[PDB]
Protein backbone atom coordinates (compact mmCIF):
# COMPACT_ATOMS: atom_id res chain seq x y z
CA UNK A 1 0.00 0.00 0.00
CA UNK A 2 2.46 2.61 1.27
CA UNK A 3 6.25 3.16 1.23
CA UNK A 4 8.40 1.72 4.07
CA UNK A 5 6.95 2.50 7.49
CA UNK A 6 3.86 4.61 6.71
CA UNK A 7 0.37 4.31 8.13
CA UNK A 8 -2.83 6.30 7.79
CA UNK A 9 -3.95 8.31 10.81
CA UNK A 10 -6.72 10.69 11.82
CA UNK A 11 -6.20 14.21 13.11
CA UNK A 12 -7.73 14.62 16.55
CA UNK A 13 -8.52 18.28 16.09
CA UNK A 14 -9.68 18.35 12.45
CA UNK A 15 -10.67 14.75 11.73
CA UNK A 16 -8.73 14.88 8.48
CA UNK A 17 -6.61 11.89 7.52
CA UNK A 18 -2.84 12.26 7.54
CA UNK A 19 0.15 9.97 7.17
CA UNK A 20 2.70 9.04 9.86
CA UNK A 21 6.06 7.26 9.50
CA UNK A 22 7.07 5.26 12.59
CA UNK A 23 10.74 5.07 11.55
CA UNK A 24 11.37 8.78 10.89
CA UNK A 25 8.54 10.14 13.09
CA UNK A 26 7.56 12.32 10.13
CA UNK A 27 3.93 13.28 9.63
CA UNK A 28 2.29 14.96 6.63
CA UNK A 29 -1.15 15.52 5.07
CA UNK A 30 -0.54 14.22 1.54
CA UNK A 31 -0.29 10.56 0.57
CA UNK A 32 3.38 9.49 0.63
CA UNK A 33 5.19 9.12 -2.70
CA UNK A 34 6.15 5.55 -3.56
CA UNK A 35 17.62 1.46 -0.74
CA UNK A 36 20.94 3.15 -1.57
CA UNK A 37 24.31 2.13 -0.22
CA UNK A 38 24.84 5.63 1.19
CA UNK A 39 22.93 8.77 2.15
CA UNK A 40 24.03 12.25 3.16
CA UNK A 41 22.28 13.92 6.11
CA UNK A 42 22.39 16.98 8.31
CA UNK A 43 21.01 17.04 11.81
CA UNK A 44 20.14 19.34 14.68
CA UNK A 45 20.86 17.78 18.08
CA UNK A 46 19.30 18.82 21.37
CA UNK A 47 21.02 17.09 24.29
CA UNK A 48 19.50 16.54 27.74
CA UNK A 49 20.57 15.46 31.21
CA UNK A 50 20.46 11.74 30.26
CA UNK A 51 22.55 12.08 27.08
CA UNK A 52 25.74 10.00 27.04
CA UNK A 53 27.85 13.17 27.19
CA UNK A 54 25.75 15.95 28.77
CA UNK A 55 28.04 18.64 27.38
CA UNK A 56 28.39 20.56 24.13
CA UNK A 57 30.03 23.64 22.64
CA UNK A 58 26.94 25.61 23.77
CA UNK A 59 26.94 24.53 27.45
CA UNK A 60 29.63 22.97 29.63
CA UNK A 61 26.97 21.27 31.80
CA UNK A 62 23.71 20.41 30.02
CA UNK A 63 20.96 20.25 32.62
CA UNK A 64 17.69 20.36 30.64
CA UNK A 65 15.32 17.42 31.05
CA UNK A 66 14.43 15.09 28.20
CA UNK A 67 10.93 16.56 28.17
CA UNK A 68 12.39 20.08 27.85
CA UNK A 69 14.67 18.91 25.03
CA UNK A 70 11.69 17.44 23.20
CA UNK A 71 9.80 20.73 23.54
CA UNK A 72 12.71 22.61 21.95
CA UNK A 73 12.92 20.07 19.11
CA UNK A 74 9.19 20.39 18.49
CA UNK A 75 9.49 24.17 18.40
CA UNK A 76 12.34 24.04 15.87
CA UNK A 77 10.30 21.69 13.68
CA UNK A 78 7.38 24.13 13.74
CA UNK A 79 9.53 27.05 12.59
CA UNK A 80 11.24 25.03 9.85
CA UNK A 81 7.88 23.83 8.50
CA UNK A 82 6.37 27.31 8.61
CA UNK A 83 9.39 28.74 6.78
CA UNK A 84 9.93 31.23 9.61
CA UNK A 85 13.40 29.70 9.94
CA UNK A 86 15.71 27.52 7.88
CA UNK A 87 16.95 24.16 9.12
CA UNK A 88 20.55 25.22 8.50
CA UNK A 89 20.12 28.43 10.48
CA UNK A 90 18.72 26.67 13.53
CA UNK A 91 21.31 23.90 13.36
CA UNK A 92 24.16 26.43 13.25
CA UNK A 93 22.77 28.35 16.22
CA UNK A 94 21.30 25.65 18.49
CA UNK A 95 22.56 22.16 17.68
CA UNK A 96 24.48 20.56 20.56
CA UNK A 97 26.67 18.76 18.00
CA UNK A 98 30.09 19.88 16.78
CA UNK A 99 28.52 19.69 13.32
CA UNK A 100 26.65 22.91 14.13
CA UNK A 101 29.60 24.79 12.66
CA UNK A 102 28.90 23.04 9.31
CA UNK A 103 25.18 23.87 9.28
CA UNK A 104 24.58 20.38 10.74
CA UNK A 105 26.08 18.47 7.81
CA UNK A 106 27.44 15.00 8.65
CA UNK A 107 28.52 14.01 5.15
CA UNK A 108 27.75 10.73 3.46
CA UNK A 109 27.63 7.39 5.25
CA UNK A 110 26.66 3.73 4.97
CA UNK A 111 24.67 1.55 7.31
CA UNK A 112 26.79 0.44 10.26
CA UNK A 113 28.31 3.74 11.35
CA UNK A 114 25.50 5.67 13.16
CA UNK A 115 23.35 4.79 16.17
CA UNK A 116 20.49 2.60 15.03
CA UNK A 117 17.46 4.93 15.41
CA UNK A 118 19.43 7.65 13.62
CA UNK A 119 20.52 5.24 10.90
CA UNK A 120 17.05 3.80 10.29
CA UNK A 121 15.52 7.28 10.05
CA UNK A 122 18.27 8.53 7.75
CA UNK A 123 17.79 5.63 5.32
CA UNK A 124 13.96 5.79 5.35
CA UNK A 125 13.87 9.52 4.55
CA UNK A 126 13.56 10.43 0.90
CA UNK A 127 15.98 12.93 -0.63
CA UNK A 128 15.05 16.35 0.70
CA UNK A 129 12.74 15.06 3.42
CA UNK A 130 12.98 15.93 7.12
CA UNK A 131 12.42 13.66 10.10
CA UNK A 132 10.34 14.22 13.16
CA UNK A 133 11.99 13.87 16.58
CA UNK A 134 14.42 10.93 16.58
CA UNK A 135 15.68 9.59 19.94
CA UNK A 136 19.20 8.17 20.51
CA UNK A 137 21.59 7.86 23.42
CA UNK A 138 23.10 11.13 22.25
CA UNK A 139 19.87 13.11 22.52
CA UNK A 140 16.95 14.08 20.30
CA UNK A 141 17.64 14.78 16.59
CA UNK A 142 15.98 16.51 13.68
CA UNK A 143 17.39 14.82 10.56
CA UNK A 144 17.47 16.31 7.06
CA UNK A 145 18.37 13.98 4.20
CA UNK A 146 20.29 15.98 1.61
CA UNK A 147 21.51 13.26 -0.79
O1 LIG B 1 33.79 14.56 9.34
C2 LIG B 1 34.01 15.67 10.12
C3 LIG B 1 35.22 15.85 10.76
C4 LIG B 1 35.35 17.00 11.51
N5 LIG B 1 34.36 17.89 11.63
C6 LIG B 1 33.21 17.63 10.98
C7 LIG B 1 32.07 18.63 11.08
F8 LIG B 1 30.94 18.03 11.43
F9 LIG B 1 32.32 19.58 11.97
F10 LIG B 1 31.86 19.23 9.92
N11 LIG B 1 33.01 16.55 10.22
O1 LIG C 1 27.86 6.75 17.64
C2 LIG C 1 27.28 7.99 17.61
C3 LIG C 1 27.87 9.05 18.29
C4 LIG C 1 27.22 10.26 18.21
N5 LIG C 1 26.08 10.43 17.51
C6 LIG C 1 25.59 9.34 16.89
C7 LIG C 1 24.30 9.49 16.10
F8 LIG C 1 24.15 8.51 15.22
F9 LIG C 1 23.24 9.48 16.90
F10 LIG C 1 24.26 10.64 15.43
N11 LIG C 1 26.16 8.14 16.91
Q: How far apart are CA 118 and CA 93, in angstroms?
A: 21
Are the beta carbons of 99 and 56 closer than 8 angstroms? no
Q: What are the boundaries of each domain within the chain?
A: 1-32, 38-147
- Give the ligand whose atoms come closest to the C-alpha of residue 98: 1
Query: CATH classification of 1-32, choosing from 3.40.50.10140, 2.20.70.10, 2.60.40.10, 1.10.3720.10?
Result: 2.20.70.10
Measured distance CA(28)–CA(9) in Å, rounded: 10
Catalytic residue among 41, 43, 48, 131: 43
List the residue whose alpha carbon is closest to atom 5 of ligand 2.
Answer: 138
Determine the Cα–Cα distance for residues 32 and 50; give it in Å rounded to an integer: 34
Q: 103 vs 50, 62, 65, 86, 116, CA distance in Å?
A: 25, 21, 25, 10, 23
Give the max Cα distance, the chain: 48
Give 76-93 as a DSSP string: HHHHHHHTSS-HHHHHHH
Atom 4 in ligand 2: residue holding the nearest Cα: 138
**138 catalytic, yes or no?**
yes
Discontinuities after residues in the chain (C–N over 2.5 A)? 34
What one-character DSSP code corresponds to residue 6? Answer: E
Is residue 131 within 8 Å of 25, Cβ to Cβ? Answer: yes
What pairs with residue 43 in β-bridges?
Answer: 143
- For 38-147, the fitting CATH number among 3.40.50.300, 3.40.50.620, 3.10.50.40, 3.10.20.30 is 3.10.50.40
Amino acid sequence: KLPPGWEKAMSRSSGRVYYFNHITNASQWERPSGEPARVRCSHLLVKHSQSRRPSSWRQEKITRTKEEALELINGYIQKIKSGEEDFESLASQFSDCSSAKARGDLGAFSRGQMQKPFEDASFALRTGEMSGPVFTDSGIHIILRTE
